[PDB]
Amino acid sequence: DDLYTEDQRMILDAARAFCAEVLAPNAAQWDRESHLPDEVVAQMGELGFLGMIVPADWGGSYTDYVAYALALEEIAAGCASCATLVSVHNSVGCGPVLNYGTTEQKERWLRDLASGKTVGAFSLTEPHNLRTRAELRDGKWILNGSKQFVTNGARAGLAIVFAMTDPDKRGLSAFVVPTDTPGFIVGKPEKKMGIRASDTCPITLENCAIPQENLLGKRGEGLKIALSNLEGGRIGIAAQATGIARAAFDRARRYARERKPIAEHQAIAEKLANMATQINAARLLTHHAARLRTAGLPCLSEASQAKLFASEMAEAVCSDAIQIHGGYGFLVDYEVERHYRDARITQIYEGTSEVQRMVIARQL
Amino acid sequence: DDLYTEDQRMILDAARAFCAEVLAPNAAQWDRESHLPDEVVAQMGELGFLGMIVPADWGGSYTDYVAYALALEEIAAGCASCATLVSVHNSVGCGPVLNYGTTEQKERWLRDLASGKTVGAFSLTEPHAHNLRTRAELRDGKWILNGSKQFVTNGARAGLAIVFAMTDPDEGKRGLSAFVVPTDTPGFIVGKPEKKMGIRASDTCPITLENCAIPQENLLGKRGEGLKIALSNLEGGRIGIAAQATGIARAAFDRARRYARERVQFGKPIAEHQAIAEKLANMATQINAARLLTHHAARLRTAGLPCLSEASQAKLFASEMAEAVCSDAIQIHGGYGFLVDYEVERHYRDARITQIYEGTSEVQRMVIARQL
Amino acid sequence: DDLYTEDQRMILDAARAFCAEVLAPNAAQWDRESHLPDEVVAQMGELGFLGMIVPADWGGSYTDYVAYALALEEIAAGCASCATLVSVHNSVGCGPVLNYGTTEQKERWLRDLASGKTVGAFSLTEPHAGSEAHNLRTRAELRDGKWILNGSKQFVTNGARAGLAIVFAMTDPDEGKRGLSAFVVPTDTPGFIVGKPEKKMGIRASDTCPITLENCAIPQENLLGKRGEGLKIALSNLEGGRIGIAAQATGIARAAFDRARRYARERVQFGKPIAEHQAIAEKLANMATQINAARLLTHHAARLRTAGLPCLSEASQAKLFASEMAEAVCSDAIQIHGGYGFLVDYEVERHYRDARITQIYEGTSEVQRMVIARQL
Amino acid sequence: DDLYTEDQRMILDAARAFCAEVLAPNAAQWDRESHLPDEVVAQMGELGFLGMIVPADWGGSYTDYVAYALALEEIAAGCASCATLVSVHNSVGCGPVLNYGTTEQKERWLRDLASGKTVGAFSLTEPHHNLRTRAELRDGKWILNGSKQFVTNGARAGLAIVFAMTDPDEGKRGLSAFVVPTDTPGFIVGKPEKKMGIRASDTCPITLENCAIPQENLLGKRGEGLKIALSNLEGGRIGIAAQATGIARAAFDRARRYARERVQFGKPIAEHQAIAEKLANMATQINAARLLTHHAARLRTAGLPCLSEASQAKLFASEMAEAVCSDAIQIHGGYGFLVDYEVERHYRDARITQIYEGTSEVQRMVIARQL
């Protein structure tokens, strides 16, 4: 930990101890029951894990993005579903309100988002850019449409919902929708291969009317807003891939050392060497992008490179962790099978690998 | 199909029909409930799938190994757990009895294995880290077995197990013997099925032998021949798992390519995107190569030629490929690929075991290298 | 071998002897001099390797395509450059004349192509146009009873040694994809100007030449097929071409692997033959497995083609797979050799250099993928 | 660059200018002739490139190891052979004398090594730790006999750090290190080896036949030879990591420019998704390789343990370089296989990085050992 700053090493310690004491012993159960207890979410709130990229005067704990990634790496090593909840809540639950909310808006919502009292959700994508619509009639914005894969959909108190307001690029607007609003209809959580305890829900909007002052930004600023947190999001998920890969690697190398022991059979040792090299490269790409972002510099390509690299790495590293365990690797009680299922999603959400490659290439 | 013989196409069509009518629509449920219905196993019996490498003379359906491979690829595309059952039963349930059994032993057990009335299992490996701790002592005209075995596929539904034990500890490599143990023999204790990431409906159980006393005539082959017997269906087992890996990959590939033709993003079917197209071509290439390696091994095996390397190449290749094709199949589905209801996530989970069992990839590589 | 037919074993035996006696011992020198002696090309002629896909009654030696792939793999295992020459001459030198030639045109040319008295070249690619092979700027105009070719061509294999070239030219510039025509052009024709062979990383003894056509006049009866049929003709030997390159990749890789496995048995490090080191043994096992899959893809495409069945996909899969496999196999061979792997005298560096072209010519990997995907 | 330091940016900018004006225009010709012009070596010396990990007090230009890695990357991108010479000279030419030499020894040789006046070589391995080359103390001199293998800079070096058995029966603690002037009678340098790549980096066998040197040329203590042989592994590996990053980067830069110029089916080929995907993968792996390499250098700069980290950088960069060079070939199509388009030289040069300064297999052993 010698190369990190003092802020960064403090977050790392706090994160480490939380993860060892609360996440790691319970993640198997949470996966098996597809459910993360709310008191664990609340406790993440109290510790500042749900406002790590909100400034401290708005109720958060932001220091820099390297710290953020270190915390999300630790949290993902303990529980990949927690890391999903946290990466989404901080980046796209908190980000839009902080960056485009008026002062009154931030007073209404941001301190509760940043403290974790209110969990946040972001809803842009749709089953088939958009067909969800919002009409302004009699002082209320009225939303009708259908939305897909909303992380934190069941538990969020607020949702940033994107909707077509003016059908002729600047045709979308963003809304803060409290999730108890009549006509905000959240469906049953999707059944997923992995991150099973991170609730991922479809949402139907059926004349969901919200006050006019719940418009977020100016009318027509929807797309820009939806795109304002790609760097933070991708950095977050790259950090998550790194943590999940690292957890499986930690188990593999512990199993190799105990099962001479198999860690000095050439082939096993080569896998472990490869796994360590790849995990460390993923971390360094993640941190490099986080430094640029901390400094306010352009870093979409760098963040997309981290997310790309870390995500693909993680599936291969988790696959080696299984292989190193033999027959036991396929068994639930040995946990690496969980890490393998959890890892897979990182290549898909927050921009697919194909999208990550498009943007990196665009800028060469 | 016009590339295959008459017999082969017939076995292929019979299995296609069974997988479409019975397996494919119910796989998802069986994965969900971690259980294959006894009657579906009995129906594979009735159809000859549980005797495909047993001569017709002994009640089986043997034509050749390519045909075996074709049937297993089809079963696997519909239900990976079914393929596991079928492949283990046929190769290591039926094989030891067929090759090493006396005539009377073949009459007492082989007809029922081949018909599928008796499901067979095979138990050599043990849960500690050749050098077995499980023992057999000859006492008053009976073999008495004491031991603990690990991961017996078909462990719960098998009526017979081939069970290997130390009979002569001084003799080392010739220290082992093989025994046919009816699973209802007192002292044959089946534990709870293991909880696995995939092939969840294939029962995999630890077993203990506790003063498990069996008739002297249940010794399979000669005393001390157990190792040799334990190693004599490696070719067949490995051919079948390579076929299974091929079928699993093919199911996910078929779902993904159909999805890529129907799904529209950026104003064209996604199969018209170059990156997607490249995955689809790589998938088809790798599946075809895996099938070609498998059938080449099968062809050598059918002609009684030595083929342990060719069988191991095919199993190594098909197993590694199946993970990469299934991963690609998930990716082409985007977020839907991660969803249970889109099924490719089941194919991925199921395929991962193929690199491990029937000899790990590491073991496969060792034999292939040994002959180079 | 037991799985092959008597014709297949016969050609296989013949190629093997030739490759040990003539090719393998001299290949290093030819790479070094960037030159294949004419007497070696004549011997391949005499032995029937330049007619392996022309029927016997036209002077060829065609039995089936599996035989062809076996012969090409051997030839390639001894000299990659030689395999390039053979593959091109057979598929696109002979093929166009065989398939589209009149009786008179086959009597004039195909017996000499099939015996190897005359080496064949194929010229389509231009400086601006490779993978997009239809937009041609080379032109052909009828004046005074002769076809007059003017233009510029690129990367012609066998370009300096060939006696005939199948040249593709725009006869009808406003007719697009139906505007190409194919022409048999004697390479001694005035205005058929062969540039100096390209300097390449690998297959350095396979002459690969630019060609300038300048008031290059030929008899009217050197038109091959119907006017406008050029594109169809240019695309009519894809399967055979790709089968042969797949077999070439397989043979180059095999040669690298044979050296590596022998060296790993002999070389000792940390008290045993490095072959017994598990990481080495794994590399060896992966190399065998991949070469074997390549071969089986190639022979499967060869069977469909022998039966006249459609097989462009299967041929493209073999080519893609073999070519990419060969790079990784030759790379493993280098690594198994340690620091000796980088040295010219240890040969495997040459196989690595030679292997790399197989992913590019006879349709790039990207093109192979497009056609495999399209036919799903 | 914003993220580098004033010294880092300083050495980077100088390496850039110099790669661009001297190295990159002439690298093809040097590869073709298998020869680096002496005056170019002298310019590297003069510019401080041959003293980059020796302190300023001893005639060097040492700032930190991140600066070293940046400069090696740039040199490598203009001329892989020059980078091989530079990496070796700094790491194992200067390193032993710097760290194990007496003050008298450092005054005698280290300043000339650091200024580039004298180029240094290092000679441990033989054709077959268990070594045949012997040194015998006789009449106030060490007399060396043996055969040595693949000495980089073997034909231009003025001094060679040679390792020999002083005490055959003490095994690993029976080796000693010696500073040998290369003009010493009985120091016979054979013909440079014929190689696939880095052809202008001279790589020579050396025969020592009754090669007699002063008693005071023992380096470190008698028996300390293996420890000295292993004392610059970190530096060496960081250097080759930077080499591999640079070679790949050169091929990458050519391929990405080509892709924006070459049109096929109506658009620049960089806009075909399959090419874009290659370019994106090349950029990402190259950056990953630099970041591993700089991470290692930071640990080295701070004097912290970093053998594994440098081994990870060297392993990752070297394997990466082959794959990136291969893509660069592919992106060029047929042109990629032609000498005039340069990417085929980069691919050839890149392949050595997986083998020397320890094979991939050796890198992976040290990484594993330490987990």
Ligand SMILES: Cc1cc2c(cc1C)N(C[C@H](O)[C@H](O)[C@H](O)COP(=O)(O)OP(=O)(O)OC[C@H]1O[C@@H](n3cnc4c(N)ncnc43)[C@H](O)[C@@H]1O)c1[nH]c(=O)[nH]c(=O)c1N2
């Ligand atoms: C040694 C040797 C020998 C021969 C030949 C080449 C060489 C190097 N060829 C020519 C060969 O067929 C040619 O190199 C390929 O068609 C590739 O074309 P270019 O080199 O013009 O690359 P080109 O400019 O077409 O492509 C550059 C890169 O972009 C990619 N690309 C192009 N279009 C694309 C698309 N739509 N989507 C995705 N990617 C795309 C390609 O795959 C390639 O990777 C030939 N020719 C001949 O007529 N007669 C002969 O005998 C020979 N022999």
